[PDB]
């Protein structure tokens, strides 16, 4: 995967939630993106009230979409999701699996530094 879409949806019933995902994925495919899979994080109470499209939301559903897309089409996807009203907060980040966990050896102890002053009689 290359890009990850942290998608938060307004809490609603099963039919409209499926419809919202169906058209959101359709918008991604129109911009030239090959979506890998869709991950569902369930519905949870939002950490804080989020104001979007003249509404106050306290509960929402979380969904995650990962895809390969050209670099120039990220703005179009972000702009398209902003106009949509069934999505409360869209964010796009590079997929964390793109970077590899750098190998580590240990906590190297830093010795105290000497020779910071002259040796004259204080």
């Amino acid at each position: 995967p290359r890009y990850e879409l942290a998608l938060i949806l307004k809490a609603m019933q099963r039919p409209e939630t499926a419809a919202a995902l169906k058209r959101t994925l359709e918008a991604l495919m129109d911009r030239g993106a090959v979506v890998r899979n869709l991950e569902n994080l369930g519905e949870r109470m939002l950490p804080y009230k989020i104001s979007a499209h003249n509404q106050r939301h306290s509960r929402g559903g979380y969904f995650l979409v990962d895809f390969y897309a050209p670099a120039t089409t990220v703005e179009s996807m972000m702009e398209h999701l902003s106009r949509d009203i069934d999505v409360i907060r869209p964010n796009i980040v590079k997929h964390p699996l793109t970077q590899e966990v750098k190998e580590c050896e240990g906590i190297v102890p830093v010795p105290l530094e000497e020779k910071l002053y002259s040796t004259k009689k204080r």
Binding site: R2, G32, V34, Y68, A69, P70, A71
Partner: protein
């Protein structure tokens, strides 16, 4: 000025055998469509030296470095 074709495999995934037998899905995922500007520079540099330089395998030569700077 140069214009790398869009539907071309990036520098790394070219010499490996058995590419043309793969479906269009993977070829799309390796083409310049799903590659950033950094991969584009590699294709520009690779093509540019093969057209003007005499010995491409030599990197320490002055002519090779001048080509590299021109790309940047």
């Amino acid at each position: 000025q140069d214009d790398p074709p869009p539907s071309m495999l990036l520098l790394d995934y070219q010499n490996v055998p058995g590419i043309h037998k793969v479906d269009d899905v993977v070829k799309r995922l390796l083409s310049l469509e799903m590659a950033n500007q950094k991969e584009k520079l590699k294709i520009k540099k690779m093509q540019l030296m093969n057209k003007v330089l005499e010995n491409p395998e030599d990197t320490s030569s002055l002519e090779a470095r001048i080509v590299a700077l021109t790309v940047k």
